[PDB]
């Protein structure tokens, strides 16, 4: 029942530092940090054993990585200094049993975006609706990634397609989240998209209903 | 340092058996661990110490390691198995991962359901118009989407996005967005997206006239 919970998505200027936290919720082992650049593979950054106060780091980070822990609070930390645009990745913390070599518990990941640019929250617009109808929400002009989209506060999951973001000519992202529903439900049921953009602190709820 | 070699892709029909190889110089001398990563999710340990299996992992997942090749075998492949699979070892005080193998499920031709969405009134206020064409639940991934404005074929003003294989039916979905100024959008009436796909006898067009309800 232990769950590794990580800190939220961040934008960091190049030449700066990032500290990512990993909390062992209903728990307390080897703590590992693995990163993933978008569309690429898993890359080990290092491990740390708080009990033996021992750390092992990966070569290829120029000694910019520091892994720490606080046993009092059961939170693990990864600090990465001298951030460059190549460090834009999802950062995973993972826990494995002592001397075993594998990681049976993983955190949800933290997307760290290395950018000189300022954060921009999205504008959310509705995609208004035989037997099956389609509706959705357009999530336009945001930076950086990621955005999350739920339907009816998570009650509606079936028939949902949230598309990968496209990078527009503006250098900003845009995505659509769509859902197919029964035509008979339009006029009865209420469909709302819940959009969240953590880097900008934007939280928008938008109703996708047919025109007058 | 030590190199793990995985093929980038493996494709299998439902009910069939997938074999994901992990090549390494005398990999049989090491303990091989396997992770499954579904799109937008964290990796999940599926096989540890060559052939052992964690609690919630189906018996259909099995591992083997001898000589220069470790293999993850997935029997009776389902749409829920679509993911990227990574092998991992420890070598000279370092964690080494394979480059990953994407598992694609080979399903039948499925025609898309096509929907067109006009720009919202709220967006029009901002001086920009986004017209969206939706291709829902089709296979294979290749689809030609053509935008037509007052019968004039559009070019360089649309972008497409495609979902990963559906976890339940193995299809894809595509969104095509046509971006115009409020000026250009208001200068025309007929908005259409024409869809060419191998699951359709002839191309399907979905259209709307700027102004109707």
Author numbering:
A (entry chain A): 1 to 28, 32 to 132, 139 to 221
B (entry chain B): 1 to 213
Q: Anything the authors wrote about it?
A:
We report here the crystal structures of two neutralization-escape-resistant human monoclonal antibodies in complex with their peptide epitope. Epitope II is involved in binding the cellular receptor CD81, which is in line with the fact that the HC84 antibodies inhibit binding of E2 to CD81. The structures reveal a short α-helix in the epitope projecting two hydrophobic residues into a hydrophobic pocket in the paratope, which we propose is similar to the interaction with the receptor.
Therefore, we performed co-crystallization trials at 20°C as described in Materials and Methods. Both complexes crystallized and diffracted to at least 2.2 Å resolution. The peptide corresponding to epitope II forms a 1.5 α-helical turn spanning residues W437-F442 displaying the typical extensive main chain hydrogen bonding pattern of an α-helix. It continues at the C-terminal side of the helix in an extended conformation comprising residues Y443-K446. The peptide is bound such that the N- and C-terminal ends interact with the heavy and light chain, respectively. At the heavy-chain side, the paratope forms a hydrophobic binding surface with contacts to W437-L441 within the short α-helical turn. This surface extends into a hydrophobic cavity into which the aromatic side chain of F442 at the C-terminal end of the epitope helix inserts. On the peptide side, analysis of the solvent-accessible surface area that is buried in the complex shows that mainly residues L441 and F442 interact with the heavy chain, with 60–90% of their solvent accessible surface area buried by heavy chain binding. The main contact residues for HCV E2 binding of both monoclonal antibodies have been mapped to L441 and F442 by alanine scanning mutagenesis. In contrast, a superposition of the variable domains and the peptides of both complexes revealed only small differences, indicating a very similar antigen-binding mode for both Fabs. This was expected, because the two heavy chains are essentially identical (apart from three residues at the N-terminus) and the light chains share ∼76% identical amino acids in the variable region.
